[PDB]
Design a protein around this ligand. Structure first.
Ligand SMILES: OC[C@H]1O[C@@H](O[C@H]2[C@H](O)[C@@H](O)[C@H](O)O[C@@H]2CO)[C@H](O)[C@@H](O)[C@H]1O
Ligand SMILES: OC[C@H]1O[C@@H](O[C@H]2[C@H](O)[C@@H](O)[C@H](O)O[C@@H]2CO)[C@H](O)[C@@H](O)[C@H]1O
Lengths: 134, 134
């Protein structure tokens, strides 16, 4: 959206993508998108502090050919505005696995059946400080 | 670019960019470009193992409106095909400072007078393993 945008990422199944960034002090939410391009996201990772009617909830969704799928909300919320947060992501043909700052990890279905992830983008509330490929 | 491409970097003067990657085992050379966009580069970092008459020489240049500037060549070459390569680049108003693995540093004039670096791209011979911003 307004943050870092990376293409030709070439992330393959099993590889661990580590993303560390600064959550804006006045952030009401932040976004980290992963997929083929801006209209095809295998993972729209959206922690919401107070936004879109939700409070302290991580909302995940997929975007296929521009269409948003069914959202999934997570069980925990290890985030806070104006702080550094790191997330670790891996995937296989069936699911993406996301590990959070608290070490908690959950899965989100790989609805685009991606065998490679080439696009990543952060919005204006998540300033990426480091990206690593394991 | 062939390799990783990142936009919206918004790297300001005084900020440092750290890039670590793996050089293709059969690479004749590899490239790391920095600038405003693909046609306006404040730094074309091109270590050449065997290309264009160069043998193990770091060639740097600027690109203005798609036109290559006057090349600069360094006295050391701490790189090798099939091995990891890490460089640290600091952006400043007058010059960019490049720090190599060995600790060797050199400067390259900010010919385009860029006030920020928003574009980064590695070519097909440089596989980025991690990038740290500021
Ligand atoms: O699904 C991701 C998508 O959600 C939009 O907001 C939704 C909100 O999540 C939902 O609970 C509500 O019922 O409808 C809203 C509008 O469709 C966000 O606006 C969009 O940016 C994405 O985050
Ligand atoms: O200047 C960077 C640019 O150089 C091109 O090759 C040059 C070569 O370095 C020079 O010695 C010769 O006189 O002209 C060639 C063509 O301009 C590379 O081909 C290009 O990829 C960049 O590396």
């Amino acid at each position: 959206a307004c943050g870092l945008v990376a293409s030709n990422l070439n992330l393959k199944p099993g590889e661990c993508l580590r993303v560390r960034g600064e959550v804006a002090p006045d952030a009401k939410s932040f976004v980290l998108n992963l997929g083929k391009d801006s209209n095809n996201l295998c993972l729209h990772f959206n922690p919401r502090f107070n936004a879109h009617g939700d409070a302290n909830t991580i909302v995940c969704n997929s975007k296929d050919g521009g269409a948003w799928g069914t959202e999934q909300r997570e069980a925990v919320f290890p985030f806070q505005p104006g702080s550094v947060a790191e997330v670790c992501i891996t995937f296989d043909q069936a699911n993406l696995t996301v590990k959070l700052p608290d070490g908690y990890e959950f899965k989100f279905p790989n609805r685009l059946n991606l065998e490679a992830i080439n696009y990543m983008a952060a919005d204006g509330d998540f300033k990426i400080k480091c990206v690593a490929f394991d």
